[PDB]
Every structure is written in structure tokens, then in C-alpha cells.
Amino acid sequence: SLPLAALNMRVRRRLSLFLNVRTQVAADWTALAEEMDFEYLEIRQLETQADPTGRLLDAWQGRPGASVGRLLELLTKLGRDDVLLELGPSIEEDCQKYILKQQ
Amino acid sequence: SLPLAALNMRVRRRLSLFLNVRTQVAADWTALAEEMDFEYLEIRQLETQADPTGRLLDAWQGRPGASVGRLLELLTKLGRDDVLLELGPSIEEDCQKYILKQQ
Amino acid sequence: SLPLAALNMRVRRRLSLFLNVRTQVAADWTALAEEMDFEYLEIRQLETQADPTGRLLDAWQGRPGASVGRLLELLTKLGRDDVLLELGPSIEEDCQKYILKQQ
Amino acid sequence: SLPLAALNMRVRRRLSLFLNVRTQVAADWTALAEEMDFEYLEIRQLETQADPTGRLLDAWQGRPGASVGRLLELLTKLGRDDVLLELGPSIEEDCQKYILKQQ
Amino acid sequence: SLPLAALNMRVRRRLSLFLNVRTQVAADWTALAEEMDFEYLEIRQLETQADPTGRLLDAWQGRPGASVGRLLELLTKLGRDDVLLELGPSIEEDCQKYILKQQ
Amino acid sequence: SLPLAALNMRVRRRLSLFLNVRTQVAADWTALAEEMDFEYLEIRQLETQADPTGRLLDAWQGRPGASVGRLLELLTKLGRDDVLLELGPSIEEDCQKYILKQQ
Amino acid sequence: SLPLAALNMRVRRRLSLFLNVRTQVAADWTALAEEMDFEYLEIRQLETQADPTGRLLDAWQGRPGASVGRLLELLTKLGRDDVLLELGPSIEEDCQKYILKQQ
Amino acid sequence: SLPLAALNMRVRRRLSLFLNVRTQVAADWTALAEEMDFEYLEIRQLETQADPTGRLLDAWQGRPGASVGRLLELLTKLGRDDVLLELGPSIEEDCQKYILKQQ
Amino acid sequence: SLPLAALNMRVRRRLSLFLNVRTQVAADWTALAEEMDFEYLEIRQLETQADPTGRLLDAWQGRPGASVGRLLELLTKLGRDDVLLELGPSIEEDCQKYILKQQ
Amino acid sequence: SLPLAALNMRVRRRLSLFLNVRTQVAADWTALAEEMDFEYLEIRQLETQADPTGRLLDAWQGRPGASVGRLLELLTKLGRDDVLLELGPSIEEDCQKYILKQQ
Amino acid sequence: SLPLAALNMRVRRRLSLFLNVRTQVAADWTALAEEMDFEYLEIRQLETQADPTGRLLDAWQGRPGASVGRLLELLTKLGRDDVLLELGPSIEEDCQKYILKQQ
Amino acid sequence: SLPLAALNMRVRRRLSLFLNVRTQVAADWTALAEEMDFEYLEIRQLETQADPTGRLLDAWQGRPGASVGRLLELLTKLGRDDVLLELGPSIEEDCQKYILKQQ
Amino acid sequence: SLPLAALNMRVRRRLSLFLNVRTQVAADWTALAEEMDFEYLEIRQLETQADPTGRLLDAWQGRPGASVGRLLELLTKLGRDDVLLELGPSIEEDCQKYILKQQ
């Protein structure tokens, strides 16, 4: 559907709080980065700078498959329903704000 | 119900004091880790780093069945009523604080 | 009320010292930029150049809702009462100077 | 087809919002600048001044292969379909305005 | 009283030496971060970057209850009188310097 | 053949689960680190940081003999056929993905 | 067949209760350790640390002949049918769980 | 008097050599940990990690009664005059060094 | 031979992906920076800013020994044949493009 | 004595190499910035931009106490005799050049 | 020899591409500006406007030591042989054109 | 004599391999840190970040007694002649390189 | 001669298998630890952690008399010719590998 420029700073910080908690067992932002067809060296470069989830979403702005619904189904494919229950209405509320800005 | 981000540092330390006392006979954090569908190698990786209960709860943040009530009923399924009598009101008090933060 | 041209260089530097301290947790200038209906790409463009709070106030000069009182109530909506206690009398003192310049 | 003077300020700002978000992994304006046969020192000179995408399009005004359709196919060669879905109708609407100005 | 901008780099380093010694038993900076109404994911994000006490004080700059006396009474509520006996006169000496800078 | 940048995060975590189970009798990651011509002090430095198998593979990125097939035959020389039966098809599936990324 | 990572913590504790009862006459874990081609000094090193059956199974993770069926036939070769009658269905139930995790 | 930050690494290792020799009869570091008002689960958590005397002194850094003279009188209350005869002049020599660092 | 202005953005990013993976054991970009006669404080200054390999190549633009072949033989002297097998044809392809631009 | 315009680019880079190595323990440029009566928010603003020592000396150009000898005695008050032994003759050589330019 | 009016726009742009790449480590145009006896405030004024190398050469038009050979030996004194190998024949070709214009 | 900026990355890594092997009995980097008049909380802060020997040498850059010969005699005072026999000629070879850079 | 960093993981495990078999009559690792001038409390601290021979060799890395030949003659002074007949060629083979690494 619509690109990830609809997601403003408040949602993109709340995704960061969940996803850059770096765990060796479960699906942190590196599992998401692998599901978005990033090379290992790209993920390893994103590990260095702070907020790697935000830089991951910035690097996944211009990619041939990127959208908001693709992000919401990749977060379901990872099984992390932690984020879709809290960022459920906020992502829709920032979708409708971007649509109203496009009028 | 609500995710394990409602559980702040004070409760998550008091669960750690009970659960990472590693016993060969009774139900320590490894029995809880088995009840949360972790592989043996995941539990064996969590044994290495300090506070394995806290890293266990961090790795069980994003999992398809995780919640606070699921944790409270898995601690009942293990029979450890040691923790539910002391962390009874504290888990509710940090549930209501997270709800009030969501307003 | 009156536009943000009443705010001269001394107040606009003291807002910059508080607001462009970039934090991942609390409300820096990006939370304020989101509260003023800026797109994510606008905020991301303002991050690049130095003094992003000053360029944020320059980009919020000509906007349909902009005023001094709107700024003072958006800084209350973010909860940052750090700035309203120190820039309390200075914003009024530069309001009254702009009024006296209009005579 | 027709040169890049057909692209007025509104499209050239919306390309700037997408393309000068400088990422180390994906295709920002420097990948586009490399696809338009610029030397490394030219791109390095364009990095210094603000809005490097606008100065990139100004430096690619007079070049032997430059057109609007060449820009639209170089943005497809980079795979960034982020911009062609939002700047789809606007580039055509400013093409038809330039044609009507030529009568 | 007065905000935490009165606390310069020397005091803010000496608080860091005491408070980011991370202990599982006593009150390190995470107990202080919980006493300042931070979510678990905020504290978990502050654990990642170096000097978490300094980033904790930066994130507690703009918060509705923040002051120097609030910090001095939260360090008493944690019972850590280690810091109030050594940073006793230094916090007052940097309070009086900030007051003299305000004249 | 092809370098270890073909091995993305999912395989490199599954090698970590088998290989950093530290045993005194059998061949854990330290036997593999010795087979890759590392000094004792290098292995002793890799023991300190978490995920020593991942940091071992990162330190064996740029080495004169490193490849994917060299890793698969060093894991056979150690006799650990535990990993080649489960990471059999996954290493080939991430080889073919890296080849398709090179086109 | 499938490796010993299928055996989670509950089965690996119930094997430990039977097998590390150290007897001079019958077949405890040292007879099993001899049947798995361990040297005397390896078994003597495993005697020192607590739960020697669990460390024995960890040291027999990566070995050229190790599997679950090999363990079940070595426990038959020792004649200990004490364990195969109680850990009969549990080893199959944790085999099928590992297969379902591999999907 | 003065806090336990006066005690540097050499004294804190020599206390560790005496006190973490774990005896069932006499007063090792657990008797000292009980005399410093630690809960049983705190002491049981300190038993797990290596150098429990050093982690005990780190956890007794910020506590309402902690000082160097309190430590020297709690080691007298336990009757262990083994440590006060060898760490007699060294604790004073590191007290006077901390005082000279405070000037 | 020819200077490092022949190396455009695509090669200079692919060198960055390999070389700024910062390892304590092997030869990352700091070993290369030492082989190019940089002082420790220069390398320590280059560590601070992002993409230190790109800023390293920019600081090694104007140096008395710098060329493309010198870079290719210093990457052989470090033994990193990881980069010469993938950036083999690309460095020649951007050499021949710079020569054709010089005509 | 004479102002800091006597210090040209070569000395001001060599002070930068020593002083902006950011350490948590010793006296980097932030201790010097505190000794020159800068507020915490000023130092925090200078941390953001690259070469903070050079921007620190630029912000300490016009200040009521600034001179070259004041800088040389503040670098002695911090105890950093690292810089006065190497930038000993160079600061005098650029003092005498500024005097000869004033004739 | 002959003044810098012999250097036309094409050479003066190619010197600009090399020299105004602003590096903190090597010799950019500010090292050249220091070698031509400019004050720090002059160089700091030249930093503000775009193409600082061209404005540097314009400000070094009328100076008592300025010539083309002085520029070619100051670029050798800085060790930047990057520019003398590419702007070797072009500076001579624009010297001979200026001589032929003087006839 | 000469400061620790003479010691480049290769020597400073080889000191790190010997000195940050953390032992409870012998003289690791913490004994060296105590011999260089660091407080316990400084050493405890240096323990947290990786390569504590390198950060120890960075924090001992600007200190009133620091030099290369002081380091070589403090490593003799600790009795560690392990490092002076292997880093014997390398420290002199990087001393003479720094002297030749000073010319 | 050469230090104990020449002894890699395979020899250091084979010494551990012989030497940490703890006997009350013969010469285990504690007799060797006494022959290397360790205090009783040091040996008693090394008894606690697993592989006490490896931690004994790590604590005897930096000691004024430590070498490989000193170890081989202290194992002869204890009369244990069990280890010199099996670790005869392996210690020489890892000596020659360390020499070839020093080239």
C-alpha cells in the first residue's frame, strides 16, 4: 500500500523500544533485517550506530517491496505479536494522517 | 492480556532472586524456560550469561503466547507458589501503572 | 496571538539548548516537530543541518496554526516544564518589545 | 524526451525529501549521482552544500543524456519505487504544464 | 527548585562512577530510573549505550517533576547515602554557579 | 569458494547454539578456533565477549584461507557432524541467495 | 536419526536421576560414558562437576556417532531397562516436538 | 567515616583471598553478608558469580550504613582477626591516598 | 598508478562493509590505517565519525604514496583476500571508467 | 596576553587530536570546557558537531578572560602535560608570527 | 614567475575538487591556506562561502609572494602529489596560453 | 620521555592480548590501573567496556606522569616480563617512527 | 625461553586431563601450583573454579620466571613423566608454530 514515510517519529520510536532489545534467542531487529533481504554485512553495519531499528527502517525506505502492510506482515511472520497489539491503532492513525495530508 | 513490558525492574529482579537459584530437583528458571517452548540449546545459551531469568523474560518478550497472565499461570503450573504470594500485589501494581501510562 | 517573529535570537538560542539535546526516551525537538504536523521526511531533513530547533522554528514561521501561545501550549503538551520556567519571563519580555515596535 | 526544466520547485523538493536521506546501505542520492556518471569528487563536492539532490539535478541539467524519462528510468534502475508511486502523477502534471507553456 | 542544567560535567561524571556500577542486589542506576517513572523498555534502551547514568539524567531533563532537589531526595529514597556525602558540597557549588550565571 | 558474508544471521545463530556450548571434553568453538590458526590469547579474548562463535566467524572473515567450504570441512575435521546434518540445506540456501544477489 | 538437542531439560533431568546414582557394581553413568568411547581421564574429569550425566550428554552432543536412537540402544546394551520404561514416551514426545519445530 | 571507594583493587583482592574460602563451620563471606543485612536470596545470588566477596563489597557500596570503619568493626564482630592483622596498614594506606586525592 | 578518485561510491561502500567491521583479533580498517602511516590519534579521530573506512580513504587521498595499486597491495599485505576476490573486477571497471573520462 | 587568533590551523588541529579523544575517566575537552565556565548545555551542544575542541576554541574566542596564556595555564590546571610538551614551541612560534604580523 | 591569472576556470575547478574535500587528518585547503601566511580568522572566513579553494586563490592573487611556481612548490611542501600528477600538463598548457596572449 | 601517542594500534593490541586476560591471582590490567593512581570506581568503569587495556591507555594519555618509559617501568614493577620480551623491539620501533614523524 | 602463549588450547586441555585429577597422595596441579610460588590462598581460590590447571597456567602467564622450558622442568621436578612422554612432541610442535607466527 502506502510507504513508510507515513510512520512518524512516535511510532518509529515505539518500534525501536521493542525491536532493538538485542536478544540471542528470540527475534530482535536483526531477524527483521534478515527477513527484509539485507546482507549480513549490512546488518553488521547497522549494529554499530545507535537506534538500529530506526536506521533499518530508513534503509528500508527505498526498497522494491517496502510498504506499511509489508512491515505489518513481516512482524507477523516473525511471530512478534508484542508490537501489533500496542502499535495497532497508532500505525492506522498515522496512515490516515498521511492520507489526509495527501488529501 | 497485557505484555511483559508492564513488568519493570523491581519485579523483574525479585523474580530473578527466586528463579535463578539453580536446583537439580525442583523448578528453577530452566523448568520455566522449558514450559515456554524453548529448545535445550536456547536454555543452555541462557545459562551462560548472568541473570538468566531476566534474559529469559527478555527472550520471551516477543513470542506468540506471551503475556503477564500467561506468566502467572505458568508459575502456577510449575507449582511455585513461593513467587505468587510475594509478587502478588507488585505485578498488579505495575500492571495498573502501565495502564495509566497508556491512559 | 502574535507570530514567532517576536522571538529574537536570545530566546531562540535558549530553546535550542534545551530542545536539540537529542534523546531517544524523552521529548526532544523531534517530538515537538511531530506535534506541529511535520512529516517524518521533513523532520529527517531538519536533523541534518545544525541547530535543528532553530530551523524547526523557521519552518514553523509560516504555518496555519503558528503563534507564540501555540508554542507555549505545545511545550506544555509535551510535558517539558523545563523550558517554561526559565523562558517564562523572556518570551513575555520579547512579546512586549515586539508590541512596542508595532506601537 | 523533455529536459529537467519541466520539473518545478514542488516536485524537486519532494524528490529531495526521499533522496537526500543519507543511508549507508540503500540507494540515496549518491547512488543516483553515480548512475549519472559523476566522478567521486563531484559527489563529494555536492555532499557539502545543503539540498544535495537539488544541486545534483541542477548539475545534471546540462549533460548529454539528461531528460525526465532518463531520470524516471534511473530511479527504476536503483529499484527505488518509493518515489515513482508518489511522484507519478506530479511529474506528468508538470510535464504537461511545460508543454502548455511551449504551446 | 532549579533544573538539572545546573549540574555540569564534573558532578555528572561523579554520579556516573557510583551509579552505573551495575549490581543485581543493591540500587544502581536502574533503581533510580525506575523511581523516575521510566518504562522497562526505556531503561533497557539506556542499558545499551555507554554512561547510562548520564543518558538517564539527559532523558530526565525534560520531565514534569525534574529538579535538583527531586534528584537529591530520590537518591535518599533509594538509601544511597554514598553519593550525598561526597556530592554534597559540589551540587550546591554548581547550584550557586548557575544562579550567578542567571544573576 | 565464496566468503562467509554469504552466511546471514539465521545460520550464524544456529552455529552459535551448537558451538558455544562450552565443554571441556569435546570440540566446542575453541577447538574450531584452534583449527583456524588462532593464537591462545586471541581465543582467550574471544571467550570474554558474548556469542564467541559469532565473533570467531567475524574475526575469521578476513583471513587468507577463509571460505564457506573451508568452514564445512573444518567442522568435519573436528568430527562434529551434529551441525552438518541440520545446517546442511541452510548453508546452501544462503549460498544460492548470495549468488543471486551477485546475479 | 536426530541429534540430542531434541532432548530438553525434563528428560535430561530424569536420565540424570537414574544414571548419576554412582554404584560400584551396576551400570551407572560411567559405564555409559565408557560405551561412548570416552577416555578414562575424560570420565574422571566429568566426575568432578555436578550432574555428570548432563555434562556427559553435553560432551556427547558433537561426536561422530551421536543420536537419540544410539542413546536408546546404548542404554539397552547396558541392560538398564529401568530408564526405557519410564523415559519411553517422553523421549518420543520430545522427538516429535523438535520435528514440529523444524516443521 | 569514608566510603568503600577508598579500597582499591589490591586490598579488595586480599580480602577476597581470605573471605571467599567457603567453610561450613567458621565465618566466611556469607557470615559477613548476613551481618550486613542481606537477605538469603541475595547471598544465594552472590554465591553464583566468581569473587563473591568483591561483588559483596560492590553491593554494599550504596547501603545506608556502609563505610570503611563499619567494615573493620564487622570483621571484628565476626572474630576474624586474620584479616585485620594483614590488612591493617594497607586499608589505612589506601584511606590516606583517597583523602589526598580529595586534597 | 592512478589516484583514489577513480574509486566511485559503489566500490567505496563495498570496501566499507568489509573493513569497518571492527574486530579485536583480525585486520579491520585500523590495521589498514596503521599500514598507511597514520598516527594513533588520527585513527582514534577516525573512529568517532561514521563510515571510518570512507573517511580513511578520504584522508588518504592526498598522501605522498597513495594510489589504487598501493591500496590493492596493502590489502594483500594485511592478508585480507576477502576483498580482492569480490572487488577484483569492480576496481578495474572503475579504473577504466576514470581513464575513459580522461580520454 | 594575546588572543587565540594567534593560534593557526596546525596547532588547533594538534590540540584537537589530544583533547577530543573522549574519555570517561581523565580530562578530555569537556573538562577543559567546564574550566572555561561553559554551561552543561553548551558542552552538550558542542558534543554534537565534529571537532568539538576546535568549536570549543571558537566559542572561547570572545569571552572576558580568554588569552593564549590562560589556555596554557588551564591545560596545566587539568594536569594534562601531554599537550604542553609537544605544543610547547609551536604555540610560541605562532605567537611570534602573529606579533610580526602586527609589526 | 607568472601570476595566478594564467590559471583559468578549468584548472581552478580541478584544484577545487581535490582541495576543498575537508579532512581533519590530511592536508586540505586549510593547510594550504596556512602555508600561504593567512591568519586563522581569514581561513575561518573563507570556510563560510562555497568553493573555499577558489576564494583562497582569489585572495592569494595579490600577495607579495604569489606565483604559479610558488603554488606548485607549496603543493609539494604539503606532500599532496595527487594534484601535481593530474594538473601537471594543464597548468603548463594554461601558462603557455597566457604567454601567447601576452605575445 | 615521549608520550603514549607514539604507541600505534599494533602494539596497543598486543598489550591488550596479554593484559586484559582477567586473572584473580596475578597482575592483569587492573593491577596496572592501580599502579597508575586510578580510583577503584574508575577501574570499575573501565571493566564494563570492551578492550579495557586500550581504554586504560587512553585514559592514561593525559596524566601528569605518563610516558612510554613510565609504562615500561610500571610493567617491570608488576613483574610481568611476559610483555617486555615480546613488545621489546616493537615499542622502540614505534618510538623511532614517532620521532621521525616529528623530524 | 618463550612464554606460555605458545601453548594453544589442545595442549592446555591435555595437561588439564592429567593434572586436575585431584589426588591426596601424588602430585596433582596443587603440587605444581606450590612449585610455582603460589600462596595457599591462591591455590585455594583456584580450586573453586572449573579447570584449575588452565586457570593456573593463566595465572602463571605473567610471573617473573615463567616460560615453556620452566614448565617442562617443573613437571620433571615433580617426577610426573606421565605428561612429558605424551605432551613431548605437541609442546614442540606448538613452539615451532608460535615461532613461525613471529616469523
Residue numbers in the entry:
A (entry chain F), B (entry chain J), C (entry chain C), D (entry chain B), E (entry chain G), F (entry chain I), ...: 19 to 121
Give sentences copied directly from the paper behind this entry.
The human genome encodes ten TLRs and all, with the exception of TLR3 (Akira et al., 2006), require the cytosolic adaptor human Myeloid differentiation primary response 88 (hMyD88). Receptor ectodomain dimerization facilitates association of its cytosolic TIR domains, providing a scaffold for the recruitment of other TIR-containing adaptor proteins, in particular, hMyD88 and MAL/TIRAP (Akira et al., 2006, Gay et al., 2014). hMyD88 also encodes an N-terminal death domain, which is joined to the TIR by a linker region, the intermediate domain. In vitro, hMyD88 death domains (hMyD88DD) assemble with the homologous domain on the interleukin-1 receptor-associated kinases (IRAKs) to produce an oligomeric structure, the Myddosome, which has an unusual stoichiometry of 6–8 hMyD88 subunits and precisely four each of IRAK4 and IRAK2 (Lin et al., 2010, Motshwene et al., 2009). Here, we show that the death domains of human MyD88 spontaneously and reversibly associate to form helical filaments in vitro.
Iterative helical real-space refinement as implemented in RELION (He and Scheres, 2017, Scheres, 2012) was used to calculate a 3.1-Å cryo-EM map—as judged by the Fourier shell correlation (FSC) = 0.143 criterion —of the hMyD88DD filament with refined helical parameters of 5.98 Å and 98.01°. The hMyD88DD filament can be described as a single-stranded left-handed helix of death domains and is similar to the ternary death-domain complex (Lin et al., 2010). The inter-subunit interfaces are composed of type I(a/b), type II(a/b), and type III(a/b) interactions (Park et al., 2007, Weber and Vincenz, 2001). Type I and type II interactions occur between successive layers while the type III interaction occurs within each layer. Therefore, hMyD88DD filament formation likely proceeds via an initial “seed” consisting of a type I or type II homodimer, which then associates into a tetramer and continues to grow. However, our finding that hMyD88DD spontaneously forms helical filaments whose architecture is identical to that observed in the heterotrimeric hMyD88-IRAK4-IRAK2 death-domain complex (Lin et al., 2010) suggests that the helical arrangement adopted by hMyD88 during signaling is an intrinsic property of its death domain and is therefore independent of its interaction with either receptor or adaptor TIRs.
